[PDB]
Design a protein around this motif. Structure first.
Motif, mmCIF file in Angstrom:
data_model
loop_
_atom_site.group_PDB
_atom_site.id
_atom_site.type_symbol
_atom_site.label_atom_id
_atom_site.label_comp_id
_atom_site.label_asym_id
_atom_site.label_seq_id
_atom_site.Cartn_x
_atom_site.Cartn_y
_atom_site.Cartn_z
ATOM 1 N N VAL A 237 0.801 -1.216 0.000
ATOM 2 C CA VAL A 237 0.000 0.000 0.000
ATOM 3 C C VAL A 237 0.841 1.278 0.000
ATOM 4 O O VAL A 237 0.325 2.335 -0.399
ATOM 5 C CB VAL A 237 -0.988 -0.011 1.190
ATOM 6 N N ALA A 238 2.113 1.212 0.397
ATOM 7 C CA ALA A 238 2.977 2.392 0.510
ATOM 8 C C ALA A 238 3.021 3.236 -0.765
ATOM 9 O O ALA A 238 3.380 2.749 -1.837
ATOM 10 C CB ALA A 238 4.389 1.965 0.895
ATOM 11 N N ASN B 69 -1.489 3.321 -3.349
ATOM 12 C CA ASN B 69 -1.738 2.037 -3.993
ATOM 13 C C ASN B 69 -2.703 1.200 -3.150
ATOM 14 O O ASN B 69 -3.026 1.569 -2.018
ATOM 15 C CB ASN B 69 -0.421 1.287 -4.219
ATOM 16 N N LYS B 70 -3.164 0.082 -3.703
ATOM 17 C CA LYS B 70 -4.161 -0.756 -3.055
ATOM 18 C C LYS B 70 -3.652 -2.188 -2.913
ATOM 19 O O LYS B 70 -2.611 -2.565 -3.456
ATOM 20 C CB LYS B 70 -5.484 -0.735 -3.832
ATOM 21 N N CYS B 71 -4.412 -2.978 -2.155
ATOM 22 C CA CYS B 71 -4.153 -4.398 -1.967
ATOM 23 C C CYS B 71 -5.489 -5.123 -1.890
ATOM 24 O O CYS B 71 -6.485 -4.573 -1.411
ATOM 25 C CB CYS B 71 -3.313 -4.676 -0.702
ATOM 26 N N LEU B 72 -5.507 -6.358 -2.384
ATOM 27 C CA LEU B 72 -6.718 -7.165 -2.441
ATOM 28 C C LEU B 72 -6.670 -8.238 -1.363
ATOM 29 O O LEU B 72 -5.667 -8.947 -1.229
ATOM 30 C CB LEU B 72 -6.882 -7.802 -3.822
ATOM 31 N N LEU B 73 -7.756 -8.357 -0.605
ATOM 32 C CA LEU B 73 -7.878 -9.358 0.446
ATOM 33 C C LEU B 73 -9.132 -10.181 0.197
ATOM 34 O O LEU B 73 -10.207 -9.622 -0.048
ATOM 35 C CB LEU B 73 -7.925 -8.701 1.827
ATOM 36 N N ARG B 74 -8.993 -11.506 0.254
ATOM 37 C CA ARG B 74 -10.090 -12.423 -0.023
ATOM 38 C C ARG B 74 -10.088 -13.544 1.005
ATOM 39 O O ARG B 74 -9.031 -13.973 1.473
ATOM 40 C CB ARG B 74 -9.988 -13.013 -1.436
ATOM 41 N N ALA B 75 -11.284 -14.021 1.343
ATOM 42 C CA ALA B 75 -11.448 -15.094 2.316
ATOM 43 C C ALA B 75 -12.531 -16.050 1.838
ATOM 44 O O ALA B 75 -13.602 -15.611 1.407
ATOM 45 C CB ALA B 75 -11.801 -14.541 3.702
ATOM 46 N N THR B 76 -12.252 -17.351 1.919
ATOM 47 C CA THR B 76 -13.171 -18.372 1.423
ATOM 48 C C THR B 76 -13.019 -19.631 2.260
ATOM 49 O O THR B 76 -11.948 -20.248 2.262
ATOM 50 C CB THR B 76 -12.908 -18.684 -0.054
ATOM 51 N N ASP B 77 -14.088 -20.017 2.958
ATOM 52 C CA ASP B 77 -14.108 -21.289 3.669
ATOM 53 C C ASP B 77 -14.340 -22.474 2.740
ATOM 54 O O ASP B 77 -14.226 -23.621 3.186
ATOM 55 C CB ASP B 77 -15.179 -21.268 4.770
#
Lengths: 74, 76
Positions: free
Chosen positions: A73-74, B35-43
């Motif tokens: 993210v930085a 900037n961004k980041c993608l986070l995903r969760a799936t059981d």
């Protein structure tokens, strides 16, 4: 591949990230029924995983998880 | 299911309660622009996801690190 120790999986997975930041991904698998955890940092070129629940690792595992999040993210 | 950064935490809470008897809960974190980041969760049954930018990373890790350490209790 399976660095089933510490501070050697962390320095290698962090170097996988600094190599190519766009392709690298880190999964975090939890299994409460059997009572284990699983980290993996794969880089589209290599693959590193880390088992061994050992709850004294729960804190150092998610800090490693939350530390990579600040580099995206930085 | 792409949610807000708040709805993501309540649904991630139930994935640790749903598989409290049996099941795995995955969490895949990855870089993302397109900037961004993608986070995903799936059981395995239900998928949830969110996008965390530099505008809400400080607000995220705090509630996110509390949820993780609390709902993860393994070996002694």
């Amino acid at each position: 591949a399976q660095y089933q120790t510490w501070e050697e999986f962390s320095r290698a997975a962090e170097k996988l990230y600094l190599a190519d930041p766009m392709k690298a991904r880190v999964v975090l698998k939890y299994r409460h029924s059997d009572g284990s955890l699983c980290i993996k940092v794969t880089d589209d070129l290599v693959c590193l995983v880390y088992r061994t629940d050992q709850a004294q690792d729960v804190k150092k595992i998610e800090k490693f998880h939350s530390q990579l999040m600040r580099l995206m993210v930085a | 299911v792409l949610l807000e950064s708040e709805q993501f935490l309540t649904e991630l809470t139930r994935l640790f309660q749903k598989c409290r008897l049996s099941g795995s809960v995955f969490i895949t974190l990855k870089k993302y622009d397109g900037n961004k980041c993608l986070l995903r969760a799936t059981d395995g049954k239900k998928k949830i996801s969110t996008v965390v930018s530099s505008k809400e990373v400080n607000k995220f890790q705090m509630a996110y690190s509390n949820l993780l350490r609390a709902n993860m209790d393994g070996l002694k």
